[model samples]
Target: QPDPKLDELNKVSDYKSNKGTMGNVMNLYMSPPVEGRGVINSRQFLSHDLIFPIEYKSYNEVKTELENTELANNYKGKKVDIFGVPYFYTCIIPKSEPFGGCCMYGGLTFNSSENRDKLITVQVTIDNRQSLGFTITTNKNMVTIQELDYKARHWLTKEKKLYEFDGSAFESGYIKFTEKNNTSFWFDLFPKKELVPFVPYKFLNIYGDNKVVDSKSIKMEVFLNTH
Candidate 1:
Protein backbone atom coordinates (compact mmCIF):
# COMPACT_ATOMS: atom_id res chain seq x y z
CA GLN A 1 0.00 0.00 0.00
CA PRO A 2 1.10 3.60 -0.64
CA ASP A 3 1.97 5.81 2.30
CA PRO A 4 -0.54 8.57 3.00
CA LYS A 5 2.14 10.86 4.46
CA LEU A 6 4.25 10.73 1.30
CA ASP A 7 1.17 11.33 -0.81
CA GLU A 8 0.44 14.49 1.13
CA LEU A 9 4.06 15.61 1.15
CA ASN A 10 4.31 15.35 -2.62
CA LYS A 11 1.14 17.41 -2.99
CA VAL A 12 2.78 20.48 -1.43
CA SER A 13 3.96 22.52 -4.40
CA ASP A 14 5.06 25.71 -2.67
CA TYR A 15 8.38 24.34 -1.41
CA LYS A 16 11.29 26.77 -1.95
CA SER A 17 14.86 25.88 -2.82
CA ASN A 18 18.04 27.32 -1.35
CA LYS A 19 18.30 29.54 -4.43
CA GLY A 20 14.76 30.90 -3.90
CA THR A 21 13.30 29.06 -6.85
CA MET A 22 10.68 26.33 -6.58
CA GLY A 23 12.50 23.46 -4.88
CA ASN A 24 12.40 19.98 -6.38
CA VAL A 25 11.53 17.45 -3.74
CA MET A 26 11.22 13.66 -4.12
CA ASN A 27 8.89 11.55 -2.09
CA LEU A 28 10.20 8.00 -1.79
CA TYR A 29 7.48 5.64 -0.70
CA MET A 30 9.69 2.61 -0.09
CA SER A 31 13.25 1.24 -0.21
CA PRO A 32 14.91 -0.17 -3.34
CA PRO A 33 15.52 -3.87 -3.64
CA VAL A 34 18.69 -5.47 -2.24
CA GLU A 35 21.55 -6.77 -4.47
CA GLY A 36 19.88 -5.16 -7.52
CA ARG A 37 18.62 -8.59 -8.54
CA GLY A 38 15.09 -7.71 -9.64
CA VAL A 39 13.66 -6.34 -12.86
CA ILE A 40 14.16 -2.58 -13.43
CA ASN A 41 11.90 -0.36 -15.50
CA SER A 42 14.00 2.39 -17.09
CA ARG A 43 12.82 5.40 -19.15
CA GLN A 44 14.53 8.62 -20.28
CA PHE A 45 13.24 12.19 -20.56
CA LEU A 46 14.56 14.99 -22.81
CA SER A 47 13.10 18.43 -22.17
CA HIS A 48 15.99 20.82 -22.63
CA ASP A 49 18.48 21.60 -25.38
CA LEU A 50 21.61 21.90 -23.31
CA ILE A 51 23.13 18.62 -22.21
CA PHE A 52 24.50 18.20 -18.70
CA PRO A 53 27.76 16.38 -17.91
CA ILE A 54 26.81 13.10 -16.22
CA GLU A 55 28.88 10.15 -14.95
CA TYR A 56 27.73 6.63 -15.77
CA LYS A 57 28.40 3.48 -13.76
CA SER A 58 27.17 -0.07 -13.43
CA TYR A 59 23.44 -0.35 -12.68
CA ASN A 60 23.93 -2.14 -9.39
CA GLU A 61 26.07 0.54 -7.76
CA VAL A 62 23.78 3.40 -8.80
CA LYS A 63 20.59 1.59 -7.80
CA THR A 64 21.88 0.71 -4.36
CA GLU A 65 22.85 4.26 -3.52
CA LEU A 66 19.74 5.89 -4.97
CA GLU A 67 17.50 3.50 -3.06
CA ASN A 68 19.03 4.57 0.23
CA THR A 69 16.49 6.98 1.74
CA GLU A 70 19.17 8.67 3.81
CA LEU A 71 21.34 9.33 0.76
CA ALA A 72 18.38 10.60 -1.29
CA ASN A 73 17.71 13.28 1.34
CA ASN A 74 20.91 15.01 0.25
CA TYR A 75 19.77 15.28 -3.39
CA LYS A 76 18.74 18.80 -4.45
CA GLY A 77 17.32 19.26 -7.91
CA LYS A 78 14.14 19.12 -9.98
CA LYS A 79 11.54 16.62 -8.91
CA VAL A 80 10.23 14.46 -11.77
CA ASP A 81 6.71 13.04 -11.89
CA ILE A 82 6.40 9.73 -13.70
CA PHE A 83 2.89 8.31 -14.11
CA GLY A 84 1.64 10.92 -11.63
CA VAL A 85 4.19 9.80 -9.01
CA PRO A 86 7.12 12.08 -8.23
CA TYR A 87 10.71 10.77 -8.32
CA PHE A 88 13.79 12.29 -6.70
CA TYR A 89 16.22 13.65 -9.24
CA THR A 90 19.82 12.53 -9.01
CA CYS A 91 23.04 13.66 -10.72
CA ILE A 92 23.57 12.77 -14.40
CA ILE A 93 26.72 11.15 -15.75
CA PRO A 94 28.05 9.49 -18.88
CA LYS A 95 29.27 5.98 -19.53
CA SER A 96 33.00 5.22 -19.48
CA GLU A 97 35.11 4.98 -22.65
CA PRO A 98 32.82 4.01 -25.55
CA PHE A 99 29.79 5.89 -24.25
CA GLY A 100 31.61 8.62 -22.34
CA GLY A 101 31.23 11.23 -25.05
CA CYS A 102 27.42 11.30 -24.92
CA CYS A 103 25.28 13.26 -22.41
CA MET A 104 22.99 11.35 -20.01
CA TYR A 105 20.97 11.75 -16.81
CA GLY A 106 19.23 9.31 -14.41
CA GLY A 107 16.61 9.36 -11.64
CA LEU A 108 14.64 6.99 -9.40
CA THR A 109 10.88 7.02 -9.89
CA PHE A 110 8.40 7.46 -7.04
CA ASN A 111 7.32 4.19 -5.53
CA SER A 112 4.02 3.29 -7.24
CA SER A 113 3.83 -0.39 -6.53
CA GLU A 114 3.94 -2.91 -3.74
CA ASN A 115 6.66 -4.72 -5.66
CA ARG A 116 9.38 -2.94 -3.68
CA ASP A 117 11.70 -5.89 -4.23
CA LYS A 118 12.01 -4.90 -7.89
CA LEU A 119 13.97 -1.95 -9.29
CA ILE A 120 12.03 0.11 -11.85
CA THR A 121 13.35 3.35 -13.35
CA VAL A 122 12.97 5.99 -16.05
CA GLN A 123 16.16 7.50 -17.64
CA VAL A 124 16.31 10.53 -19.98
CA THR A 125 19.06 11.44 -22.38
CA ILE A 126 19.41 14.69 -24.28
CA ASP A 127 21.88 15.57 -27.02
CA ASN A 128 22.45 19.20 -27.87
CA ARG A 129 23.75 18.23 -31.29
CA GLN A 130 20.54 16.35 -32.13
CA SER A 131 22.19 13.75 -34.30
CA LEU A 132 21.16 10.08 -33.96
CA GLY A 133 19.38 8.50 -31.00
CA PHE A 134 18.63 4.91 -29.98
CA THR A 135 16.16 3.08 -27.69
CA ILE A 136 16.88 -0.45 -26.55
CA THR A 137 14.39 -2.89 -25.04
CA THR A 138 14.94 -6.34 -23.60
CA ASN A 139 12.51 -9.12 -22.70
CA LYS A 140 13.73 -12.32 -21.06
CA ASN A 141 16.99 -12.98 -22.99
CA MET A 142 16.29 -11.14 -26.25
CA VAL A 143 17.64 -7.63 -26.87
CA THR A 144 16.54 -5.13 -29.53
CA ILE A 145 17.97 -1.75 -30.54
CA GLN A 146 15.64 0.71 -32.26
CA GLU A 147 16.92 3.84 -34.00
CA LEU A 148 15.24 7.21 -33.57
CA ASP A 149 14.27 9.73 -36.23
CA TYR A 150 14.59 13.09 -34.54
CA LYS A 151 13.54 15.09 -37.60
CA ALA A 152 10.58 12.98 -38.55
CA ARG A 153 9.33 13.16 -34.98
CA HIS A 154 8.87 9.37 -34.94
CA TRP A 155 10.78 6.13 -35.37
CA LEU A 156 11.95 5.37 -38.94
CA THR A 157 10.68 1.91 -39.88
CA LYS A 158 9.83 -1.56 -38.64
CA GLU A 159 13.40 -2.72 -39.22
CA LYS A 160 15.27 -3.53 -36.00
CA LYS A 161 18.47 -5.29 -34.98
CA LEU A 162 17.69 -8.29 -32.86
CA TYR A 163 20.37 -10.15 -30.90
CA GLU A 164 19.97 -13.19 -28.76
CA PHE A 165 21.72 -12.97 -25.42
CA ASP A 166 25.12 -14.64 -25.73
CA GLY A 167 25.31 -14.72 -21.97
CA SER A 168 28.67 -12.87 -22.30
CA ALA A 169 28.93 -9.43 -24.00
CA PHE A 170 25.28 -8.56 -23.33
CA GLU A 171 25.58 -9.68 -19.72
CA SER A 172 28.17 -7.04 -18.91
CA GLY A 173 25.76 -4.34 -20.25
CA TYR A 174 28.65 -2.87 -22.28
CA ILE A 175 29.84 -3.44 -25.82
CA LYS A 176 32.52 -1.70 -27.92
CA PHE A 177 33.36 -1.87 -31.59
CA THR A 178 34.95 0.04 -34.49
CA GLU A 179 33.37 0.44 -37.90
CA LYS A 180 35.13 1.21 -41.15
CA ASN A 181 34.17 4.35 -43.05
CA ASN A 182 31.17 3.07 -44.97
CA THR A 183 27.60 4.08 -45.69
CA SER A 184 25.66 1.86 -43.38
CA PHE A 185 21.95 1.93 -42.61
CA TRP A 186 20.24 0.90 -39.41
CA PHE A 187 16.57 0.03 -38.77
CA ASP A 188 13.87 1.16 -36.31
CA LEU A 189 10.73 -0.35 -34.86
CA PHE A 190 7.55 0.32 -36.71
CA PRO A 191 3.96 0.77 -35.41
CA LYS A 192 5.01 2.60 -32.30
CA LYS A 193 3.45 1.42 -29.11
CA GLU A 194 1.92 3.51 -26.35
CA LEU A 195 4.62 5.06 -24.16
CA VAL A 196 4.33 3.75 -20.63
CA PRO A 197 7.07 4.48 -18.09
CA PHE A 198 8.15 1.34 -16.25
CA VAL A 199 11.04 -1.03 -15.47
CA PRO A 200 13.07 -2.91 -18.06
CA TYR A 201 12.44 -6.63 -18.05
CA LYS A 202 16.25 -7.21 -18.55
CA PHE A 203 19.38 -5.20 -20.11
CA LEU A 204 26.41 -0.92 -23.86
CA ASN A 205 29.23 1.18 -24.83
CA ILE A 206 30.72 1.45 -28.30
CA TYR A 207 33.43 3.44 -30.13
CA GLY A 208 34.02 4.21 -33.78
CA ASP A 209 37.09 4.82 -35.95
CA ASN A 210 37.90 8.35 -37.10
CA LYS A 211 35.78 9.36 -34.14
CA VAL A 212 37.27 12.43 -32.56
CA VAL A 213 37.79 11.68 -28.89
CA ASP A 214 36.61 14.78 -27.08
CA SER A 215 34.08 15.98 -24.53
CA LYS A 216 31.31 15.96 -27.17
CA SER A 217 31.43 12.92 -29.44
CA ILE A 218 28.12 11.84 -30.91
CA LYS A 219 25.47 14.37 -31.90
CA MET A 220 22.94 11.89 -30.46
CA GLU A 221 21.00 11.38 -27.24
CA VAL A 222 19.48 8.00 -26.29
CA PHE A 223 16.38 7.33 -24.17
CA LEU A 224 16.28 3.90 -22.54
CA ASN A 225 13.19 1.73 -21.70
CA THR A 226 14.06 -1.15 -19.35
CA HIS A 227 10.73 -2.95 -18.97
Candidate 2:
Protein backbone atom coordinates (compact mmCIF):
# COMPACT_ATOMS: atom_id res chain seq x y z
CA GLN A 1 0.00 0.00 0.00
CA PRO A 2 1.15 3.56 -0.60
CA ASP A 3 1.64 6.03 2.24
CA PRO A 4 -1.53 8.08 2.76
CA LYS A 5 0.34 11.37 3.16
CA LEU A 6 2.00 11.01 -0.20
CA ASP A 7 -1.31 9.94 -1.68
CA GLU A 8 -2.89 13.09 -0.30
CA LEU A 9 -0.15 15.26 -1.77
CA ASN A 10 -0.79 13.65 -5.13
CA LYS A 11 -4.46 14.40 -4.78
CA VAL A 12 -3.72 18.07 -4.21
CA SER A 13 -1.25 18.40 -7.08
CA ASP A 14 -2.41 21.11 -9.47
CA TYR A 15 -1.41 24.22 -11.51
CA LYS A 16 -2.65 27.72 -10.89
CA SER A 17 -1.81 31.23 -12.11
CA ASN A 18 0.73 33.23 -10.13
CA LYS A 19 -1.21 35.30 -7.63
CA GLY A 20 0.16 38.76 -8.37
CA THR A 21 -0.09 41.75 -10.68
CA MET A 22 2.02 40.60 -13.58
CA GLY A 23 0.77 40.25 -17.14
CA ASN A 24 1.29 36.81 -18.67
CA VAL A 25 4.06 36.81 -21.23
CA MET A 26 3.98 33.02 -21.37
CA ASN A 27 1.28 30.36 -21.24
CA LEU A 28 1.31 27.43 -18.79
CA TYR A 29 -0.35 24.02 -18.43
CA MET A 30 -0.02 20.69 -16.62
CA SER A 31 1.19 17.62 -18.52
CA PRO A 32 0.43 14.18 -17.11
CA PRO A 33 1.98 10.76 -17.83
CA VAL A 34 -0.80 9.95 -20.31
CA GLU A 35 0.49 12.98 -22.17
CA GLY A 36 3.64 10.88 -22.52
CA ARG A 37 6.43 12.73 -20.66
CA GLY A 38 5.72 16.29 -21.80
CA VAL A 39 6.41 15.49 -25.46
CA ILE A 40 4.20 17.61 -27.67
CA ASN A 41 3.80 18.69 -31.27
CA SER A 42 5.95 21.80 -31.57
CA ARG A 43 3.40 23.25 -33.95
CA GLN A 44 0.97 23.37 -31.06
CA PHE A 45 3.02 25.78 -29.02
CA LEU A 46 2.42 29.47 -29.71
CA SER A 47 5.80 30.43 -28.40
CA HIS A 48 9.16 28.84 -29.17
CA ASP A 49 10.81 30.14 -26.01
CA LEU A 50 11.50 27.43 -23.42
CA ILE A 51 14.16 26.73 -20.80
CA PHE A 52 14.73 24.42 -17.83
CA PRO A 53 14.83 25.78 -14.27
CA ILE A 54 14.58 24.35 -10.78
CA GLU A 55 11.38 25.10 -8.82
CA TYR A 56 11.15 26.72 -5.41
CA LYS A 57 8.52 28.27 -3.18
CA SER A 58 7.42 31.79 -4.21
CA TYR A 59 7.98 33.15 -0.71
CA ASN A 60 11.12 31.14 -0.10
CA GLU A 61 14.15 32.95 1.26
CA VAL A 62 16.02 31.34 -1.59
CA LYS A 63 14.73 34.15 -3.82
CA THR A 64 17.45 36.44 -2.47
CA GLU A 65 19.93 33.67 -3.12
CA LEU A 66 18.59 33.37 -6.69
CA GLU A 67 18.64 37.06 -7.59
CA ASN A 68 22.43 37.02 -7.47
CA THR A 69 22.65 34.98 -10.68
CA GLU A 70 22.39 35.84 -14.40
CA LEU A 71 19.65 33.28 -15.17
CA ALA A 72 17.57 34.78 -12.40
CA ASN A 73 16.95 37.84 -14.58
CA ASN A 74 14.69 35.88 -16.92
CA TYR A 75 12.29 34.57 -14.28
CA LYS A 76 13.11 36.94 -11.46
CA GLY A 77 10.10 39.25 -11.74
CA LYS A 78 7.85 36.57 -13.20
CA LYS A 79 5.49 34.40 -11.24
CA VAL A 80 5.91 30.62 -11.35
CA ASP A 81 4.81 27.62 -9.31
CA ILE A 82 7.35 24.80 -9.10
CA PHE A 83 6.11 21.42 -7.90
CA GLY A 84 3.18 23.08 -6.11
CA VAL A 85 5.47 25.61 -4.47
CA PRO A 86 5.26 29.16 -5.83
CA TYR A 87 8.43 31.10 -6.54
CA PHE A 88 10.19 33.46 -8.85
CA TYR A 89 12.71 30.99 -10.30
CA THR A 90 15.96 31.04 -12.25
CA CYS A 91 15.98 28.67 -15.28
CA ILE A 92 18.91 27.34 -17.26
CA ILE A 93 18.71 27.50 -21.03
CA PRO A 94 20.76 24.72 -22.53
CA LYS A 95 21.71 24.22 -26.15
CA SER A 96 18.52 23.63 -28.08
CA GLU A 97 18.13 20.27 -29.82
CA PRO A 98 19.44 20.38 -33.39
CA PHE A 99 15.86 20.05 -34.65
CA GLY A 100 13.31 20.24 -31.84
CA GLY A 101 14.10 23.52 -30.11
CA CYS A 102 14.18 22.89 -26.29
CA CYS A 103 13.01 20.11 -24.01
CA MET A 104 12.35 19.66 -20.31
CA TYR A 105 13.95 16.87 -18.29
CA GLY A 106 13.32 15.60 -14.75
CA GLY A 107 10.50 17.99 -13.70
CA LEU A 108 11.54 21.06 -15.65
CA THR A 109 10.66 22.65 -19.06
CA PHE A 110 8.08 20.97 -21.33
CA ASN A 111 7.83 21.42 -25.07
CA SER A 112 4.51 22.96 -25.97
CA SER A 113 5.06 23.54 -29.69
CA GLU A 114 7.40 22.43 -32.46
CA ASN A 115 10.00 24.31 -34.42
CA ARG A 116 12.63 22.42 -36.41
CA ASP A 117 15.10 25.27 -36.39
CA LYS A 118 18.17 24.56 -34.26
CA LEU A 119 17.77 26.60 -31.10
CA ILE A 120 20.70 28.72 -30.00
CA THR A 121 22.65 28.00 -26.83
CA VAL A 122 21.79 30.22 -23.93
CA GLN A 123 23.53 31.03 -20.66
CA VAL A 124 23.14 28.52 -17.83
CA THR A 125 23.94 29.26 -14.19
CA ILE A 126 24.77 26.07 -12.32
CA ASP A 127 24.22 25.95 -8.59
CA ASN A 128 27.04 24.11 -6.85
CA ARG A 129 25.37 24.67 -3.43
CA GLN A 130 28.28 26.96 -2.59
CA SER A 131 28.58 30.66 -1.81
CA LEU A 132 29.79 31.42 -5.36
CA GLY A 133 26.31 30.61 -6.75
CA PHE A 134 26.37 29.26 -10.32
CA THR A 135 29.15 29.20 -12.85
CA ILE A 136 28.03 31.05 -15.98
CA THR A 137 29.03 28.84 -18.90
CA THR A 138 28.02 28.32 -22.53
CA ASN A 139 28.96 24.64 -22.62
CA LYS A 140 25.71 22.69 -22.63
CA ASN A 141 24.68 19.05 -22.36
CA MET A 142 22.00 17.39 -24.40
CA VAL A 143 19.60 14.98 -22.74
CA THR A 144 21.56 12.14 -24.33
CA ILE A 145 24.47 13.11 -22.09
CA GLN A 146 23.04 10.68 -19.55
CA GLU A 147 24.90 7.91 -21.39
CA LEU A 148 28.31 9.06 -20.09
CA ASP A 149 30.12 6.69 -17.76
CA TYR A 150 30.03 7.65 -14.08
CA LYS A 151 30.77 5.98 -10.77
CA ALA A 152 28.60 6.33 -7.65
CA ARG A 153 30.42 7.67 -4.61
CA HIS A 154 29.51 8.67 -1.07
CA TRP A 155 31.60 10.01 1.77
CA LEU A 156 31.36 11.15 5.38
CA THR A 157 33.93 13.14 7.37
CA LYS A 158 33.72 12.84 11.13
CA GLU A 159 36.46 13.89 13.57
CA LYS A 160 38.95 14.14 10.70
CA LYS A 161 37.83 10.77 9.35
CA LEU A 162 36.07 10.10 6.04
CA TYR A 163 33.75 7.20 5.19
CA GLU A 164 31.49 6.24 2.33
CA PHE A 165 27.80 5.56 2.72
CA ASP A 166 26.40 2.23 1.49
CA GLY A 167 26.62 2.45 -2.29
CA SER A 168 23.55 0.21 -2.49
CA ALA A 169 21.53 3.08 -1.11
CA PHE A 170 22.13 4.86 -4.43
CA GLU A 171 20.73 2.15 -6.69
CA SER A 172 19.83 3.44 -10.11
CA GLY A 173 16.22 3.59 -11.18
CA TYR A 174 14.91 2.53 -14.59
CA ILE A 175 14.87 5.18 -17.28
CA LYS A 176 13.84 4.33 -20.83
CA PHE A 177 14.45 6.83 -23.62
CA THR A 178 12.73 6.14 -26.91
CA GLU A 179 12.77 8.52 -29.83
CA LYS A 180 9.53 8.81 -31.74
CA ASN A 181 9.57 9.66 -35.42
CA ASN A 182 11.89 12.60 -36.23
CA THR A 183 10.21 15.12 -34.00
CA SER A 184 9.64 13.67 -30.53
CA PHE A 185 11.37 11.72 -27.77
CA TRP A 186 9.59 9.54 -25.22
CA PHE A 187 11.48 9.19 -21.97
CA ASP A 188 9.93 7.64 -18.90
CA LEU A 189 11.14 7.21 -15.32
CA PHE A 190 9.65 4.10 -13.71
CA PRO A 191 11.07 3.68 -10.24
CA LYS A 192 9.69 0.92 -8.03
CA LYS A 193 6.18 1.55 -6.68
CA GLU A 194 7.65 2.49 -3.30
CA LEU A 195 9.78 5.09 -5.05
CA VAL A 196 7.20 6.59 -7.41
CA PRO A 197 6.77 9.86 -5.57
CA PHE A 198 10.49 10.49 -5.79
CA VAL A 199 9.95 10.99 -9.51
CA PRO A 200 9.41 14.73 -9.34
CA TYR A 201 6.07 16.07 -10.64
CA LYS A 202 5.44 19.82 -10.84
CA PHE A 203 2.81 22.29 -12.07
CA LEU A 204 4.00 25.76 -13.18
CA ASN A 205 2.00 28.96 -13.32
CA ILE A 206 3.23 31.10 -16.19
CA TYR A 207 0.98 34.12 -16.46
CA GLY A 208 -1.23 34.42 -19.53
CA ASP A 209 -2.31 37.97 -20.68
CA ASN A 210 -3.95 39.11 -17.44
CA LYS A 211 -2.89 39.76 -13.87
CA VAL A 212 -3.79 37.27 -11.17
CA VAL A 213 -4.54 38.41 -7.64
CA ASP A 214 -5.46 36.78 -4.32
CA SER A 215 -5.71 33.01 -4.83
CA LYS A 216 -7.66 30.84 -7.17
CA SER A 217 -9.15 27.48 -6.20
CA ILE A 218 -7.54 24.72 -8.24
CA LYS A 219 -9.17 21.27 -8.70
CA MET A 220 -7.20 18.17 -9.68
CA GLU A 221 -8.06 14.46 -10.14
CA VAL A 222 -6.81 11.27 -8.50
CA PHE A 223 -6.97 7.61 -9.58
CA LEU A 224 -7.80 4.86 -7.10
CA ASN A 225 -7.85 1.15 -7.78
CA THR A 226 -8.78 -1.33 -5.06
CA HIS A 227 -8.94 -4.44 -7.15
The candidate that wins on TM-score is: 2
Q: List the residue pairs that clash in candidate 2.
A: 24-207, 42-113, 42-114, 43-114, 45-113, 57-86, 58-86, 58-87
Which residues of candidate 2, in runs, are more than 4 Å off?
Answer: 1-70, 84-171, 176-227
Worst window of 10 by summed lDDT in candidate 2: 147-156
Question: Which tens-of-lDDT digit does each residue in 93-131 have in candidate 2?
Answer: 333243122223222122233323222211111121212
RMSD (Å) per prediction: 22.4, 21.6
**Number of backbone-clashing residue pairs for each candidate, in the order shown:** 22, 8
List runs of model 1 lying over 4 Å from the truth. Answer: 1-67, 74-105, 108-160, 163-227
Each model's C-alpha lDDT? 0.20, 0.20
| TM-score, per-candidate, Cα-based | 0.16, 0.17
